[PDB]
PDB file of C-alpha atoms and ligand atoms in Angstrom:
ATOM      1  CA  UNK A   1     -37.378 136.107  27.496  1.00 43.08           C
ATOM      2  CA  UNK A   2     -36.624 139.369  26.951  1.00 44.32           C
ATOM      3  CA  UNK A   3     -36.212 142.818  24.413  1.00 43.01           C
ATOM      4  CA  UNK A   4     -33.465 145.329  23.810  1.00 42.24           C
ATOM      5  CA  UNK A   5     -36.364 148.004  22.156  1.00 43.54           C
ATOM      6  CA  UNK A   6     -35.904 151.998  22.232  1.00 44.29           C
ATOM      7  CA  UNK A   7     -38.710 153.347  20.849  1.00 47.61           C
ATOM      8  CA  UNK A   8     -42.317 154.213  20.932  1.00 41.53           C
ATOM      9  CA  UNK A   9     -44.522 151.237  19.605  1.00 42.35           C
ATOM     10  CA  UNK A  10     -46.969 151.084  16.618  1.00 41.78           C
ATOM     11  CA  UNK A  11     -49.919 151.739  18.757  1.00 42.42           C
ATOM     12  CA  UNK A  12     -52.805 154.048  17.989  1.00 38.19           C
ATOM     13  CA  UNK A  13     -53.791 155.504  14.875  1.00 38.87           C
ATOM     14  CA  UNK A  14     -54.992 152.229  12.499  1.00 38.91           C
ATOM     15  CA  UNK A  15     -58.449 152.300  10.256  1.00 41.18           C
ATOM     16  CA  UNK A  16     -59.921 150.942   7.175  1.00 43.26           C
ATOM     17  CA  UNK A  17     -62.676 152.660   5.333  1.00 42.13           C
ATOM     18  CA  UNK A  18     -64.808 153.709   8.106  1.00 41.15           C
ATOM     19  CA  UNK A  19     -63.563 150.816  10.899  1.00 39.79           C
ATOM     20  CA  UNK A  20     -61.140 150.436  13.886  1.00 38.09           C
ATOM     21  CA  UNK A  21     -58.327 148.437  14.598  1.00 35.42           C
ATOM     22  CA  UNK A  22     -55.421 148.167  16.842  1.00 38.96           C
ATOM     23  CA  UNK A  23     -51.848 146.920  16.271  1.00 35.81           C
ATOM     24  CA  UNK A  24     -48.986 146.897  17.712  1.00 35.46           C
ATOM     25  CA  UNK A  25     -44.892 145.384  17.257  1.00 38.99           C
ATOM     26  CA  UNK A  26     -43.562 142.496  18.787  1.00 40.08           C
ATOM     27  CA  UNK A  27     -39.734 141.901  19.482  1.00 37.74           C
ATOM     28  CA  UNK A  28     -38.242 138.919  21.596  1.00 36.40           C
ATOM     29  CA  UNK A  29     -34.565 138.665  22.032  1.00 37.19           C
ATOM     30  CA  UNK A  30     -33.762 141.985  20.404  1.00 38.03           C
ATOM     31  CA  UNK A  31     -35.357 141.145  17.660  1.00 38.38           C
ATOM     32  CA  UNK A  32     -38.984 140.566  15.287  1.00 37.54           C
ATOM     33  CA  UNK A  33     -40.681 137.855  17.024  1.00 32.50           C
ATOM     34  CA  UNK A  34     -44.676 138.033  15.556  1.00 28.76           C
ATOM     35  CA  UNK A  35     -46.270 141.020  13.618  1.00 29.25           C
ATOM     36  CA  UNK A  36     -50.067 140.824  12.990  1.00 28.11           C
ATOM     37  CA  UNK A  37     -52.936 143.424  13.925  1.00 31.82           C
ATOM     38  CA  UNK A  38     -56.787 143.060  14.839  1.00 29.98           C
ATOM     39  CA  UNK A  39     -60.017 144.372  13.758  1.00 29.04           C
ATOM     40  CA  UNK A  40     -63.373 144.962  16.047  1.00 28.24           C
ATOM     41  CA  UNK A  41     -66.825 145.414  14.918  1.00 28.61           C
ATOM     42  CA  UNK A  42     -68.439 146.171  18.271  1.00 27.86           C
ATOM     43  CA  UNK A  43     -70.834 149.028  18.595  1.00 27.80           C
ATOM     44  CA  UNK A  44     -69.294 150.212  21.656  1.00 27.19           C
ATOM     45  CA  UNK A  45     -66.014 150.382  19.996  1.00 29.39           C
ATOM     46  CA  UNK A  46     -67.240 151.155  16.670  1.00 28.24           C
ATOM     47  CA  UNK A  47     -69.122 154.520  17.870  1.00 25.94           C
ATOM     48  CA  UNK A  48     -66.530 155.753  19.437  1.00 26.13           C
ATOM     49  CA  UNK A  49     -65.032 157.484  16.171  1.00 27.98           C
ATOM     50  CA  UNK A  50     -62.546 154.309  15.862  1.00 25.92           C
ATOM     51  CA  UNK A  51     -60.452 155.777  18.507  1.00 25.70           C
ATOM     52  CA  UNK A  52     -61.087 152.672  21.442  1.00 26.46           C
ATOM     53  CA  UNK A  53     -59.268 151.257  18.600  1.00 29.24           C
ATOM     54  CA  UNK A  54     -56.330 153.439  18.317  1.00 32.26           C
ATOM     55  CA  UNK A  55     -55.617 152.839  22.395  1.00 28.92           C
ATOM     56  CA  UNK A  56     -57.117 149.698  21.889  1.00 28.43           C
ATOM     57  CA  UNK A  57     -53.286 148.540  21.259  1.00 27.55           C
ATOM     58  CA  UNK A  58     -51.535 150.083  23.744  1.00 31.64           C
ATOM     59  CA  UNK A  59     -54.104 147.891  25.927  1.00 33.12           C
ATOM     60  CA  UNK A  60     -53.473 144.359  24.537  1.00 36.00           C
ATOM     61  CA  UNK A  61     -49.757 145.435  23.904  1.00 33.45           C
ATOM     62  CA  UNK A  62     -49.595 145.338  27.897  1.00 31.45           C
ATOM     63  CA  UNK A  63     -51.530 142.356  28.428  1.00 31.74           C
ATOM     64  CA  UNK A  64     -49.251 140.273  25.802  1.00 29.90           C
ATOM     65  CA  UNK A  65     -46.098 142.540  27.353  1.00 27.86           C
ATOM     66  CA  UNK A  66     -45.954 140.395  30.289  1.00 27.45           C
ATOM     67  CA  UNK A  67     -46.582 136.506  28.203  1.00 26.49           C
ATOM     68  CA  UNK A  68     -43.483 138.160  26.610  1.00 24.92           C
ATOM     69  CA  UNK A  69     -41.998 139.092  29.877  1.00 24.71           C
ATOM     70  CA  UNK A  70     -40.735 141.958  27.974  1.00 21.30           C
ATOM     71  CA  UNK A  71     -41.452 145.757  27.981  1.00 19.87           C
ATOM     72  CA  UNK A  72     -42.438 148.729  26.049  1.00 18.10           C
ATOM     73  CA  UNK A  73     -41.755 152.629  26.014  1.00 20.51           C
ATOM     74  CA  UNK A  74     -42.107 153.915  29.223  1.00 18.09           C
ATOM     75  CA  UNK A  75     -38.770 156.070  29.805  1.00 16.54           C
ATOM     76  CA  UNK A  76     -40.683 159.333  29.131  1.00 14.04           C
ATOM     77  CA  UNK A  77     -42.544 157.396  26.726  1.00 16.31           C
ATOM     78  CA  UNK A  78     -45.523 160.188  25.949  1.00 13.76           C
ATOM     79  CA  UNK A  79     -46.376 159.260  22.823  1.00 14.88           C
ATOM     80  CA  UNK A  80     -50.024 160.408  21.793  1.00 16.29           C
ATOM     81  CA  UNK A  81     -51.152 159.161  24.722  1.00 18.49           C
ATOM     82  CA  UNK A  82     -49.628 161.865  26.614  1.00 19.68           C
ATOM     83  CA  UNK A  83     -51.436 164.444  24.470  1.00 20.02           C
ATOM     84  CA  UNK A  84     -54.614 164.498  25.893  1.00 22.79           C
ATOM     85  CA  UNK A  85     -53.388 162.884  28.963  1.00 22.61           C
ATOM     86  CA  UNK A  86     -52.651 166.722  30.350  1.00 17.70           C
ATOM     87  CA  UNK A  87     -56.487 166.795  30.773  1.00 16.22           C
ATOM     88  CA  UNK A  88     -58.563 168.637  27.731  1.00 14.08           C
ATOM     89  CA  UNK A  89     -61.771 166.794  28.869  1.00 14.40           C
ATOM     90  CA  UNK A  90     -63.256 165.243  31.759  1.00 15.42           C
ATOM     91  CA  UNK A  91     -62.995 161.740  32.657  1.00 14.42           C
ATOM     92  CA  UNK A  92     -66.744 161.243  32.097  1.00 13.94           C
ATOM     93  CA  UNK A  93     -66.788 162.808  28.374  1.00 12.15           C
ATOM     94  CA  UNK A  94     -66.250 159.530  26.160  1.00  8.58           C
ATOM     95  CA  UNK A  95     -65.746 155.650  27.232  1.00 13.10           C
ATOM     96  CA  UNK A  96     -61.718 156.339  27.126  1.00 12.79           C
ATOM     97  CA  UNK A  97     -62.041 156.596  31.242  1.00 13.57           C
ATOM     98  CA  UNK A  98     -62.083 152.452  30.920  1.00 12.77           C
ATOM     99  CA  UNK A  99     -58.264 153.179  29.988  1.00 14.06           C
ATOM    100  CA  UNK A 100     -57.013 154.455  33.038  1.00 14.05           C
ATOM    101  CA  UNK A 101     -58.704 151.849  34.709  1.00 17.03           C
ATOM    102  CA  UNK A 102     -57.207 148.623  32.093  1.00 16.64           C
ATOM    103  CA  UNK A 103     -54.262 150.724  33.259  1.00 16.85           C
ATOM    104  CA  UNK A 104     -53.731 149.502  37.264  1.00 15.94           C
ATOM    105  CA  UNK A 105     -55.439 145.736  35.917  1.00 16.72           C
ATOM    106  CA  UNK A 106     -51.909 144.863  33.871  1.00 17.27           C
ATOM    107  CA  UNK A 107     -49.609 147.608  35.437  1.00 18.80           C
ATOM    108  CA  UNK A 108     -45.955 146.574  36.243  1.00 18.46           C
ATOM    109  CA  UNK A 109     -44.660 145.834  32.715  1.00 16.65           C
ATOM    110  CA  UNK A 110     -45.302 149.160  31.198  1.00 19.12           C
ATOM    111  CA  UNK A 111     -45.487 152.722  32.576  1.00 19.54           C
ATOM    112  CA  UNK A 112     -47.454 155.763  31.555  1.00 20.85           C
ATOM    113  CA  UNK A 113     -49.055 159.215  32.736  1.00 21.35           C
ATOM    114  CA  UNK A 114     -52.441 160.264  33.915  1.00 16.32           C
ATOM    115  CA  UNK A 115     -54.930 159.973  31.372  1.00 17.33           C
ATOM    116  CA  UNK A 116     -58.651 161.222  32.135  1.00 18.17           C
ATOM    117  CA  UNK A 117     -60.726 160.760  28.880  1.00 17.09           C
ATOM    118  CA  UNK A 118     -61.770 162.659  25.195  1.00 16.21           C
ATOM    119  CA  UNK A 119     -59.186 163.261  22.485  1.00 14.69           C
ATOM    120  CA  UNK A 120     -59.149 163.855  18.944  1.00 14.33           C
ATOM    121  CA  UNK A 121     -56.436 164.614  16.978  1.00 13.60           C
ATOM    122  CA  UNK A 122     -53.192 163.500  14.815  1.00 14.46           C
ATOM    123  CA  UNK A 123     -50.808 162.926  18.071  1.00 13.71           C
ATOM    124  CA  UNK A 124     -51.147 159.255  17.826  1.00 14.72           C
ATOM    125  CA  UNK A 125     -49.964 159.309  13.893  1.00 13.59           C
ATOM    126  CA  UNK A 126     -47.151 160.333  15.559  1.00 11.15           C
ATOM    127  CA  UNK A 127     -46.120 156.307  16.374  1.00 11.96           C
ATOM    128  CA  UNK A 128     -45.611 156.304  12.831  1.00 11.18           C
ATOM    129  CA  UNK A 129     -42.458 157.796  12.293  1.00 10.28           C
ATOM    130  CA  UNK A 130     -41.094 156.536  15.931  1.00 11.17           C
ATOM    131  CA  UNK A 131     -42.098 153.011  15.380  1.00 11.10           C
ATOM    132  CA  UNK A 132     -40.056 153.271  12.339  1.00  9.69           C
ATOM    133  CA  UNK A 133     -36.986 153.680  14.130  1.00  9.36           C
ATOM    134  CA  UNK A 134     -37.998 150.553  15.843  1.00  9.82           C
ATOM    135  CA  UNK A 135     -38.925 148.305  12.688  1.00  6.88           C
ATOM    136  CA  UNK A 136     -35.725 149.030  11.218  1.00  5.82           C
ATOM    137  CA  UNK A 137     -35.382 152.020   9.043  1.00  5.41           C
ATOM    138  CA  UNK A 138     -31.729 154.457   7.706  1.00  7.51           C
ATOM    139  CA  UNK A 139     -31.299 158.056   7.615  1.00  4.83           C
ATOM    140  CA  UNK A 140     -28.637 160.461   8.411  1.00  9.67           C
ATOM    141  CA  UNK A 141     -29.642 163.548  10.293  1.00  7.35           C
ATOM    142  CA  UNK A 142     -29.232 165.307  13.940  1.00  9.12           C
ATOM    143  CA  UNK A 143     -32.073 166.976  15.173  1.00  8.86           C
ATOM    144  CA  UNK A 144     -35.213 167.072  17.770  1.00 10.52           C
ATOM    145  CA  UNK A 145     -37.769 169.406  19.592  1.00 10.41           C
ATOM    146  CA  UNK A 146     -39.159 169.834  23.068  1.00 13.22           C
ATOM    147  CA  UNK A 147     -42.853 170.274  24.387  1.00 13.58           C
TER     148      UNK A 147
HETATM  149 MG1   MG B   1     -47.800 154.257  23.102  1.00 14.96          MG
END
């Protein structure tokens, strides 16, 4: 029916070994309504230093985001996503073009920035700590950053 979420989902940033897998959390109602993840195996996906994985979830989180006809982070979301969004590559270097593109194919649910291609690096761990403001975690503090 509907959600009542705040915060970044648990999206990119998931291996096992040497793999690549994409997850992602589920709330209907205001509340948990599935939790589960997926693993590839694919060539295409597995050559790609397991990062099609790591967006690999913000993908099928969209797709499922409208079954749901709920929605995710997209009030100045960011996220990792927006790291190498700003452009470090172009859209040519690395398959991750095909995400803009998945992008406009299930837009209207979620919202995002301009993302050409390439990445590489930790901003996608990130989700970690946000998510767990999302799966239900307690602390006691009052502080933040800007970039
Ligand atoms: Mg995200």
């Amino acid at each position: 029916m509907d959600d009542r979420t705040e915060y970044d989902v648990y999206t990119d940033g998931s291996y096992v070994n040497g793999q690549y897998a994409w997850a992602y959390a589920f709330v209907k109602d205001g509340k948990v309504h599935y939790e589960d993840a997926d693993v590839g195996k694919n060539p295409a996906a597995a050559t790609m230093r397991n990062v099609a994985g790591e967006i690999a979830a913000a993908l099928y989180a969209v797709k499922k985001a409208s079954q749901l006809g709920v929605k995710i982070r997209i009030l100045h979301d960011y996220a990792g996503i927006a790291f190498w969004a700003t452009g470090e590559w172009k859209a040519k270097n690395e398959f991750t073009q095909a995400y803009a593109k998945l992008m406009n194919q299930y837009r209207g649910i979620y919202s995002f920035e301009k993302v050409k291609a390439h990445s590489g690096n930790e901003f996608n761990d990130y989700v970690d700590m946000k998510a767990k403001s999302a799966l239900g975690i307690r602390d006691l503090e009052h502080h933040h950053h800007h970039h």
